[PDB]
Amino acid sequence: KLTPAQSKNPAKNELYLVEGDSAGGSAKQGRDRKFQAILPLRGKVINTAKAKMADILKNEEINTMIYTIGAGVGADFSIEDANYDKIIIMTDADTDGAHIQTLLLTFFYRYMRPLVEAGHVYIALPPLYKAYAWTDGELEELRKLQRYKGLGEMNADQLWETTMNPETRTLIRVTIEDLARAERRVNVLMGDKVEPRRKWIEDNVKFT
Amino acid sequence: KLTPAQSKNPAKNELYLVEGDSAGGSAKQGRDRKFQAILPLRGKVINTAKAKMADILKNEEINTMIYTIGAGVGADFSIEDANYDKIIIMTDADTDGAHIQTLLLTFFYRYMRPLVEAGHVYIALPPLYKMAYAWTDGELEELRKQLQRYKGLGEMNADQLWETTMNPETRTLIRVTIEDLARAERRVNVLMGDKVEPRRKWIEDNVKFT
Amino acid sequence: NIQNMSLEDIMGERFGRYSKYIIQDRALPDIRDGLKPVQRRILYSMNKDSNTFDKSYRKSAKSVGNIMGNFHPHGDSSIYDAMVRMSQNWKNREILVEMHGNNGSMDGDPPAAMRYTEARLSEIAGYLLQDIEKKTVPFAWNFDDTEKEPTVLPAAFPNLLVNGSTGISAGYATDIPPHNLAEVIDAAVYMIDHPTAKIDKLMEFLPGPDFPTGAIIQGRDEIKKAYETGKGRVVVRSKTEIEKLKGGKEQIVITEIPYEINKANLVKKIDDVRVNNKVAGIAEVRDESDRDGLRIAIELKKDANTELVLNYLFKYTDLQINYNFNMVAIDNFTPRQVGIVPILSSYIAHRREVILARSRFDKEKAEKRLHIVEGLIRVISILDEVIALIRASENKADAKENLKVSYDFTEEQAEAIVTLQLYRLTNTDVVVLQEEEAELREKIAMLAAIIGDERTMYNLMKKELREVKKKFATPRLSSLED
Amino acid sequence: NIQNMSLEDIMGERFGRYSKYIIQDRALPDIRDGLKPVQRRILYSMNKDSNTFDKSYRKSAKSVGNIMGNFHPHGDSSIYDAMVRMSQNWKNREILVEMHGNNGSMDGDPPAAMRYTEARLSEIAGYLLQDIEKKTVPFAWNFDDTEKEPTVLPAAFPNLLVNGSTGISAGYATDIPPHNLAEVIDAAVYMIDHPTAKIDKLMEFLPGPDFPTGAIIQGRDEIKKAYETGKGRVVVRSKTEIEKLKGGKEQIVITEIPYEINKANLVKKIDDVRVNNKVAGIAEVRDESDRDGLRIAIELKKDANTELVLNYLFKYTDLQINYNFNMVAIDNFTPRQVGIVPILSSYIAHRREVILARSRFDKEKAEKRLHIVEGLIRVISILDEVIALIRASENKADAKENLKVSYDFTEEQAEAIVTLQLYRLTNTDVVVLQEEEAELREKIAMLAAIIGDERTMYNLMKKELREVKKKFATPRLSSLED
DNA sequence: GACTATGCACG
DNA sequence: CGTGCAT
DNA sequence: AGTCATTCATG
DNA sequence: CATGAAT
Numbered sequence A: 001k002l003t004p005a006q007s008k009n010p011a012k013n014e015l016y017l018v019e020g021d022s023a024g025g026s027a028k029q030g031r032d033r034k035f036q037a038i039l040p041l042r043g044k045v046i047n048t049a050k051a052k053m054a055d056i057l058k059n060e061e062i063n064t065m066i067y068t069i070g071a072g073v074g075a076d077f078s079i080e081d082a083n084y085d086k087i088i089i090m091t092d093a094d095t096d097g098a099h100i101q102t103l104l105l106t107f108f109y110r111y112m113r114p115l116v117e118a119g120h121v122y123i124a125l126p127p128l129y130k131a132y133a134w135t136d137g138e139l140e141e142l143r144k145l146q147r148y149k150g151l152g153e154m155n156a157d158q159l160w161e162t163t164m165n166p167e168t169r170t171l172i173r174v175t176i177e178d179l180a181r182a183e184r185r186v187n188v189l190m191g192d193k194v195e196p197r198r199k200w201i202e203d204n205v206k207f208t
Numbered sequence B: 001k002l003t004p005a006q007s008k009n010p011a012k013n014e015l016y017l018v019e020g021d022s023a024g025g026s027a028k029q030g031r032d033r034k035f036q037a038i039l040p041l042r043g044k045v046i047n048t049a050k051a052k053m054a055d056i057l058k059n060e061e062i063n064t065m066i067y068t069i070g071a072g073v074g075a076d077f078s079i080e081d082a083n084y085d086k087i088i089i090m091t092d093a094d095t096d097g098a099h100i101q102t103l104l105l106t107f108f109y110r111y112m113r114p115l116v117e118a119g120h121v122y123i124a125l126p127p128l129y130k131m132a133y134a135w136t137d138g139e140l141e142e143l144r145k146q147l148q149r150y151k152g153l154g155e156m157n158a159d160q161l162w163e164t165t166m167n168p169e170t171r172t173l174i175r176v177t178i179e180d181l182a183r184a185e186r187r188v189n190v191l192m193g194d195k196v197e198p199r200r201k202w203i204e205d206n207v208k209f210t
Numbered sequence C, D: 001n002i003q004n005m006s007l008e009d010i011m012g013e014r015f016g017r018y019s020k021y022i023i024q025d026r027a028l029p030d031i032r033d034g035l036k037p038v039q040r041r042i043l044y045s046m047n048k049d050s051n052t053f054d055k056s057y058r059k060s061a062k063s064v065g066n067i068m069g070n071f072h073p074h075g076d077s078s079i080y081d082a083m084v085r086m087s088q089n090w091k092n093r094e095i096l097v098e099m100h101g102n103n104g105s106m107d108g109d110p111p112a113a114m115r116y117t118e119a120r121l122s123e124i125a126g127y128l129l130q131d132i133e134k135k136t137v138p139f140a141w142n143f144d145d146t147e148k149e150p151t152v153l154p155a156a157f158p159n160l161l162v163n164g165s166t167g168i169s170a171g172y173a174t175d176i177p178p179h180n181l182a183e184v185i186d187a188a189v190y191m192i193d194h195p196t197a198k199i200d201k202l203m204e205f206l207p208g209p210d211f212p213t214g215a216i217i218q219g220r221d222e223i224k225k226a227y228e229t230g231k232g233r234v235v236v237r238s239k240t241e242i243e244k245l246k247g248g249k250e251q252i253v254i255t256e257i258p259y260e261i262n263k264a265n266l267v268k269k270i271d272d273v274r275v276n277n278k279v280a281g282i283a284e285v286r287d288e289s290d291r292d293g294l295r296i297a298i299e300l301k302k303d304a305n306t307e308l309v310l311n312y313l314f315k316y317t318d319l320q321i322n323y324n325f326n327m328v329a330i331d332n333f334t335p336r337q338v339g340i341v342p343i344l345s346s347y348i349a350h351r352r353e354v355i356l357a358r359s360r361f362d363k364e365k366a367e368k369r370l371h372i373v374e375g376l377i378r379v380i381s382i383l384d385e386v387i388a389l390i391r392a393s394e395n396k397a398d399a400k401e402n403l404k405v406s407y408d409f410t411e412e413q414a415e416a417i418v419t420l421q422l423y424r425l426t427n428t429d430v431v432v433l434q435e436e437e438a439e440l441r442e443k444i445a446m447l448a449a450i451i452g453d454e455r456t457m458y459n460l461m462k463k464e465l466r467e468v469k470k471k472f473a474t475p476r477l478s479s480l481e482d
Numbered sequence E: 001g002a003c004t005a006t007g008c009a010c011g
Numbered sequence F: 001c002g003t004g005c006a007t
Numbered sequence G: 001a002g003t004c005a006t007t008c009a010t011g
Numbered sequence H: 001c002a003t004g005a006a007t
């Protein structure tokens, strides 16, 4: 299920977590195989705050992540015995894409916090517009246009140019700034209890 | 895989071998569950006059049609033990419908002739046209007096399936009847055999390309 | 090449972006036409493409493709499964899509894939789209920015209650059951005349849900509770008969089952009862359902207590279930838990909006023309000098100009006059044009009145509402008790 | 009730229908445009829908659905898979469909489903359809009987040889390899001048196959046999290099592989040689192919006989394989095993029919216009008299009769005049019309000459083929050895 | 969205 | 075996 | 053309 | 455990 790097190097190597088998393929095809591995997430990733640790373990996407990163899960987790210097979550710049980022992150917080706290978890930002633009702002500079609907409309040449190439890519580094407020936020948005969530949404989401 | 009839009756019970899982479902819905069973054939059927008998007994459909007609296959075939009186082949009226009928028939001939010999193997003729329904371009001109051109079973509702092709008191059937056991061997082997040359020639001699 | 965001920060934007979309634009229906986005697109698209009830069916895949390419930016399976559901008359009380082939069954077996089936809109579906071409409803651009699409349909009948909805978003979910069309309309008509109507009165017209699968609905108190607050547990229970078999045996005969319950799974679950002898006296469970009737027969042993068994089944199977109302819908962009009254009220508000819009449009058209027809009537009176002036003109632009300057035509009249084909000059019958001038005025009067008189408008609304009911009404299927 | 039928007789009737159908309408290409029916519908449909190289891409699903709904009545996987191959530039020498997104690789991994990808016609596809709108090609009713579709495309270049085909029917199969566009055209143009040309001479223009995957083709003698009989067995061997490495170790490097071979399986089947130590010397197998260049590194041990290894691999893997020509195609509705001459002649024949039809069409159009223009020129000298005559008529038909009778205009002229918009009486400029008239006569002449003189027609056929070559020409990719 | 099995002709 | 339109 | 997993709220 | 639009 995993497409691994060519040589083992826990100081360069990178694990790309890609939404969907299809964009999985384009990443497998556009990457630099020497130091870039590909793990396609095929479907919506299990919620690790809501589910039983029993189920969390029996989960394909979840096992192969533990196994591929090879650093153990939860308590028995040693950042030392890792496999990658960077773990990169790459999804469509669409809402379900965001949802997926959300679920992966709650897994990495609840069961590999060290990894997140050590700044090894990143988030690839695919271009929003076609030259390329990421900002409704750059788009103006550029106009002096295909609105991308997901990774699946991108050629492997373009993926690399814009979002896999360390030289040309714009990344997000996920940091834990206030351990207290982070656990609050994660447990609210992703937990078993609905009402705190609804409330959160009413108070925070602007329906207009 | 199989959808059994409700009451076991080697005198009335029908076996409907239907092209594709979906039309098989449409049939499962429009059948008369008391005596009509449904065994979907999921894609093109193996050519039993071309393949090793090993790979033939490993085949999902073949296996499951030998073991539900319950008479066994080959030499060990006892017509007396069979579980249905009528075996009905129901395919689209399209060309690959034609092809499947071919493939199935060559199976019954090769490995269950007693069945074909006894006049127990039929072919359902679904209607070609709806204006009411018609089966013959001629029947069409009569209805035109007082048009959907069906491209397969896929576009018929169970209600319609029943009314025209599954209802015993409404449907036209074709009864496969071996007239001359000698000619029928040559015919099956030219068309379905492992040897290409004969068949290419047969096509050249018989098929009018216009 | 690298930017830092906090967990609390990213986790926030992401879940917010998603939550919002899933609420406004996925799982929950608009309170006015009772449709979720996917469904609205299915209908609008098929309709734009002339794929309607009076015309021949199209391949399902063709429809699905055009929805995807034009309006809905999501999986084709989502779109098709949506389409197939609108075609199943054991889920929709009034079905919006007619589909040929295997579109499923009450045994929950899989529908033929979109390569096999064909579809058109149902006739009633027509009425959800009625007058869409008259600028009666807000449009917006599609993702492509190549096409405008409607954000809500005209809705010549109140679909949200007739067909219901379900129902799973983030922070909110939905369960609205089907209701009888004639009934919902009687209530709406009443509420038009009596804005401040109370539930107790409304329920005289709209007594309770009417499931397409029929059955028995028990609990007038909880029904009322739901119509008031949008929440309520009600009981739904199978229609049963007791046949006497030979040998002092009895047979329980089921003929309608609860909404959303899989017939085939039921029959199995009932048999598991007979097989484990959880309760005593079941002889055989036997589905006898055919293409034109639902019928499960439970044969009992001689000397089995048939009430004891029937009760066991109602309790420990889905032969009887609890239906929970949970009426959430999208009102003014936001999720809103709502009962019978804000629903009907919103439907009405909307129909008002539509009818005004519709009437402005029609009247705008009759004006534009009535205006041309005056122009022509005058031209005839001075044909000779007008041809003379166009002859003098240097080109179209100048001709229109000279027409305005010398005879006080308006641009629009100028354009009409100047684009007449020569053979018009043969006609000097003003009288016919006057009959038209008249019919147009008359028409505009009637229109303006609607726009400018609230009562006159609402009467229209009622007239139309009743037409719909006369045309599509059918009898109740589900019986009510308490 | 029931009708009797013989097994002998039924098997004959059914397989006859299947055989015929799968032969002429599925698996084998038409000898003129080199397309299987499904390929032709794909192009014709995408083109009808303005899904062309110069316009934006388009959800693949939208396209597939329209194809399925209007023309090709089969599975969508068949249709989409066909459409994908047409976009894969390691299968087609000159791809006919451009496709954004994962459309496979040489490693054979699955292309994104039509849910995900977007497509449009390649620019060259344009030329296969050139003049489709000018009655240059025989049309037929679609299964619906709702829309006519082409039975062959105009083919502005000889696609059968450029992109090849393959190829499994009943009684027949086909394998025709890709060819260099510039070469094929050169051959064609020669044969146009020299109808009786023999293979030896054509091979000075069409030396042999040009795979888009490159490599080395070996067998000048078998190539001739194939170009003559339709059958032949040539050899294809991978392009390789040797790189000297640190430590005095050498390394084999493959940069091109044989047509229709899976890079991924190859590499496995090669590392299986290493692993079974089938030949001595292999350190490591390594795929190093990346988005811009194929590259398989075979690293050897310290003292290893590199010419030994390289040979063993050619012999015992697919680093070298045999391609078999089997050139079958549909000529006059029948399957014909055919070689380079039947093919090109058929192409020429066809291009002849198109150019003739095209010209008949354009001429007729031009005469009609000329006729009108002639009428307008008279009308100007009698503008007023004509206007007066129209005024004096009673209606449109009366006007035309007075035009015919009083000034000997023709029905078609009268209609033109009588349907002019009023503003035209401002543009009363006869010189510009006389200019158009001249331009028109000149055009009609040029066109009449083509229709009336074979050699003039063949010069066009040649002029044009060269325009295409100039525009789409590219270097050979496969090298040839004998 | 991957996987699974067939036909048909051909080395 | 593997190819490519079909089921 | 079925099979397989997951999300989200709910009782 | 299902429900039904999504991946």
Ligand SMILES: Cc1c(N2CC[C@@H]([C@H](C)N)C2)c(F)cc2c(=O)n(N)c(=O)n(C3CC3)c12
Residues within 6 Å of the ligand: B041, B042, B043, B044, B060, B061, D075, D077, E004, E005, E006, F007, G001
């Ligand atoms: C059924 C069936 C299969 N199987 C798997 C088992 C096999 C056995 C022989 N029935 C049937 C199978 F393995 C693959 C397909 C298939 O790829 N595409 N595109 C299809 O449309 N179908 C449907 C038949 C048309 C498939």
Ligand SMILES: Cc1c(N2CC[C@@H]([C@H](C)N)C2)c(F)cc2c(=O)n(N)c(=O)n(C3CC3)c12
Residues within 6 Å of the ligand: A042, A043, A060, A061, C075, C077, E001, G004, G005, H007
């Ligand atoms: C992947 C996937 C599945 N599975 C089954 C295995 C499971 C693994 C565990 N994630 C993935 C699955 F079981 C079903 C679907 C599906 O129905 N439709 N319509 C889809 O589009 N997909 C693709 C994900 C988008 C499906």
Ligand SMILES: [Mg+2]
Residues within 6 Å of the ligand: A092, A094, A096, A097, A149, A150
């Ligand atoms: Mg997406």
Ligand SMILES: [Mg+2]
Residues within 6 Å of the ligand: B092, B094, B096, B151, B152
């Ligand atoms: Mg078919």
Ligand SMILES: [Mg+2]
Residues within 6 Å of the ligand: C313, C314, C315, C316, C317, C318, C319, C320, C321
């Ligand atoms: Mg119960």
Ligand SMILES: [Mg+2]
Residues within 6 Å of the ligand: D313, D314, D315, D316, D317, D318, D319, D320, D321
């Ligand atoms: Mg070899």
